Structure formats: C-alpha cells, structure tokens
Design a protein around this ligand. Structure first.
Ligand SMILES: Cc1cccc(Cn2nnc(-c3o[nH]c(=O)c3C[C@H](N)C(=O)O)n2)c1
Length: 258
C-alpha cells in the first residue's frame, strides 16, 4: 500500500462536504485525488492519501540542511509518493525524482485590480507596494538564486524587509493581497493566480507575463521501485487526454466571475 503525500489546496485536494461520514481516501476530492486514483489504477497499487504534516511544499533548511514539506516526507520516509502541485526544480531533483510534468506554470505576480504595477521591474523600483512570496517553496528559491538584475533586486528587498513580506501558506498570500488595499503584491504560480482571478470577489489580477516556465510533477524518493511505472502512467494519462479532463472537471465552478 503506497503512502501518498499531498497538500490541502483547492482544487487539487479538498475535504468533501460530508467527510465526517466517510473514511480513508473517500474523505477527499479534487484534481490530485482523481489523479492519484488514475495513477494507482494504471500501475495497479493500493494507496493511502495523507496530508503533509508540516503544511509545506519543501525546501532545504539553510542551517540544518534538512528538507521539509512534501519533499522531506519523501526523502526521510514518511511517504512513498507525492501527488500535488509540486514544482519540478533542479535543486529538488538532487534528492527526489519527478515524472514528466502533468501541468505547466510560471512564477507570476498577483495584485489587487487597479494597482499601478505592470511588471516585476515596476515592483523592483519602488517600496510603497510591498511584495513577497511563500516560505519553503520553489518561488522563494528562484528569487534567492536568480542572477537577473530585476529579480536579484527584488530578492535583496524581500529577504530583509520588515515586517516580513513572506507568507506561510498560499491562501495567506492571496488574503494579504486582498486585505492590503493595493499595498501588497504576491509572487505565486500562474496556476493559482489565474484560478483565483476567475473567482468571486473578482478583485485580483495577474499582471505581466510569467517570470519562468516550469511544471508540476509526481515525485518519488530516489531509488523508488515506483518511479518508472508512475512516469509511464503520467505520459499515458496525458496522451489520453485525462489530464485535460481533470482540469475541465475541477478548474471552473458555477457562479464565479462573469
Ligand atoms: C490552482 C492552485 C491553487 C492553489 C495552489 C496551487 C499551487 N501553487 N500555486 N502557487 C504555488 C506557489 O507559489 N509560490 C510557491 O513556492 C508555490 C509552491 C510551489 N508549487 C512549490 O512546489 O514549492 N503553488 C495551485
């Protein structure tokens, strides 16, 4: 029985309305719940969905060099596979294996609609509008490592800003954009940015294009007997249009903007 780690982010994984009446994997619904079921059915294994204990995607602690988040759950044996919007990055590939991507994304900028910011460079050259990103995720790592002048300027500001411009959850980032009256911009992936832009109260927007181009992948620990079969499953699901089907199922709700 394969232990799956994932993260409670709508629309990937959500508690069903009647979850108290249900058990095990039946408590959950969403894109990654369906994807887990499809991967398991194609590979022929039983599995148990679990929510990442520390709530994080995953970064290497600068002091202890210990990985946290879903990455750490794989590296140190709490889970066998991660099925989540987990970004494929070279630093993470040092310690875990990824499938080919099942969804594309890029780093992007979220603002309150009407805020006078058109680009990363616009953000970088001012301080009235604070801006930041998620702790222990791939976007913070991207900015920390970037040698692009604009992005390094942004990092130099973010890493030393007080009070902190970083958030612990993606929902907190979005809430801070909304609560700040245009005085906070959140650096987050284009998936969440566009998903939120389409939903009530319809007060946020993605500005400029994306800052990079990456993907989400299914992750396994190095040496896992599962890696090969999981990668083949993702490729077949993609080819068969199942990933398109899951996006069409989970991305668009009734009663949203427009
Ligand atoms: C549609 C939808 C709804 C909610 C959440 C998501 C996934 N997601 N969107 N943005 C992020 C994100 O932004 N900066 C980061 O660091 C991460 C995390 C990143 N994916 C990582 O692996 O570290 N993660 C997508």
């Amino acid at each position: 029985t394969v232990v799956v780690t994932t993260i409670l982010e709508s629309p990937y994984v959500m508690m069903k309305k009647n979850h108290e009446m249900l058990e095990g994997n039946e408590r959950y619904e969403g894109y990654c719940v369906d994807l887990a079921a499809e991967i398991a059915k194609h590979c022929g294994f039983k599995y148990k969905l679990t929510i990442v204990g520390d709530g994080k995607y995953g970064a290497r602690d600068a002091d202890t060099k210990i990985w946290n988040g879903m990455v750490g759950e794989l590296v140190y044996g709490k889970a066998d596979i991660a099925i989540a919007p987990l970004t494929i990055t070279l630093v993470r590939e040092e310690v875990i294996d990824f499938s080919k991507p099942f969804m594309s994304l890029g780093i992007s900028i979220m603002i309150k609609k009407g805020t006078p910011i058109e680009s990363a460079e616009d953000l970088s050259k001012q301080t009235e509008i604070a801006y930041g990103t998620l702790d222990s995720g791939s976007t913070k790592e991207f900015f920390r490592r970037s040698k692009i002048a604009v992005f390094d300027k942004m990092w130099t500001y973010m890493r030393s800003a007080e009070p902190s411009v970083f958030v612990r959850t993606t929902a907190e980032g979005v809430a801070r954009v909304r609560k700040s009256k245009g005085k906070y911009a959140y650096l987050l992936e284009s998936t969440m940015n566009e998903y939120i832009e389409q939903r009530k109260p319809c007060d946020t927007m993605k500005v400029g294009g994306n800052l990079d181009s990456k993907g989400y992948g299914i992750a396994t620990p190095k040496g896992s007997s599962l890696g090969n079969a999981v990668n083949l499953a993702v490729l077949k699901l993609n080819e068969q249009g199942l990933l398109d089907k899951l996006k069409n199922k989970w991305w668009y709700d009734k009663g949203e903007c427009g």
